[PDB]
Amino acid sequence: RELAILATAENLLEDRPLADISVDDLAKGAGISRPTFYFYFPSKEAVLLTLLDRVVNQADMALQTLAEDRENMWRTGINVFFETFGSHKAVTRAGQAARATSVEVAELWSTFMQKWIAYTAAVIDAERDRGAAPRTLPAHELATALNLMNERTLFASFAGEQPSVPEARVLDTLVHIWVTSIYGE
Amino acid sequence: RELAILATAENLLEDRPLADISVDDLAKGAGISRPTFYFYFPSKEAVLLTLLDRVVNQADMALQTLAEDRENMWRTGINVFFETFGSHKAVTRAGQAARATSVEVAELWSTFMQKWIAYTAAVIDAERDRGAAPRTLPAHELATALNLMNERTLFASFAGEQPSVPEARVLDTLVHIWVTSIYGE
Ligand SMILES: Cc1nc(-c2ccc(C(=O)NCCC(F)(F)F)cc2)cs1
């Protein structure tokens, strides 16, 4: 029943914004009543938070799995986000828009971005320690800009935004900019 | 009176979101009544559109002025946006949030981003034609990712977002990533 509500909200988010979806909608698709819905979630907003929270953790776990040539290493890491978020475009789109109106969605996003940037910087620092990358910008600042570039450019591509890099070109585009800015210088 | 309404909306946007500002607020600060306000603008939303439209055109004109070493050339161009938007942070912040709710603000933003990306690509292409930059990524795709990185990273810095590059470091951060990704590979 919790799973059914989640699947239903993801299904419907493919067709319309969260605002055009009602508790009654989610309830119907899940095969339960409205008050029964309120036993699982306080609100439709809470349902989107849980969907985003699962997609973000799935990216984060895949990146932990990788952690356990240099161009390919970065490509494989960026690809976690391309495939994870790009396989859940409706949740990605609605979760990003909700950052504006939900402090819990904003804090969720912020917490994981900090984590991913800290880990990016730790890897740059290792590449510098081994003599493979030059000591140019402070690692954490470089990492932060690269992570934000990916956030905006991935998500603009997935949304078909104008402008955006075509989805079929965006992985290669981001990998080039990461490798050149990390190893260049 | 039109100028007074605009100055007043910019002043108040420094303190609170557009939603916490009423036509009555703008009218008061401008020294006119509410129906007199409606003679100048159809809505508070229209006032923000005009503010954004002036800041965007001021950046765009400064970039046209520049057009009339390689690291410094890119730095001087990125700086147009750092100084123009960074001198109008409240308008930047409210105008970006309005892209979600106003098609006219979305189309304005999109139109100028396309223009700035097209011009970035034309300069990369010239640098490649002269033998100074290598033919790596398609120029327009590289330009699009760099422009989106700047959009998100500048504006996160100006908003004091977590995460963000500190405002005092963001120009140097972006210049490094542009120069390395353009001349590297
Ligand atoms: C090989 C490695 N890759 C990373 C890595 C790769 C990509 C990202 C990344 O795209 N960050 C932005 C995520 C977001 F796009 F916002 F969803 C963050 C970290 C760390 S170590």
Ligand SMILES: Cc1nc(-c2ccc(C(=O)NCCC(F)(F)F)cc2)cs1
């Ligand atoms: C020397 C040159 N610089 C450019 C240039 C430099 C910077 C930008 C830029 O920051 N684009 C994003 C603007 C935005 F940040 F979104 F406001 C666009 C174009 C073109 S030719």
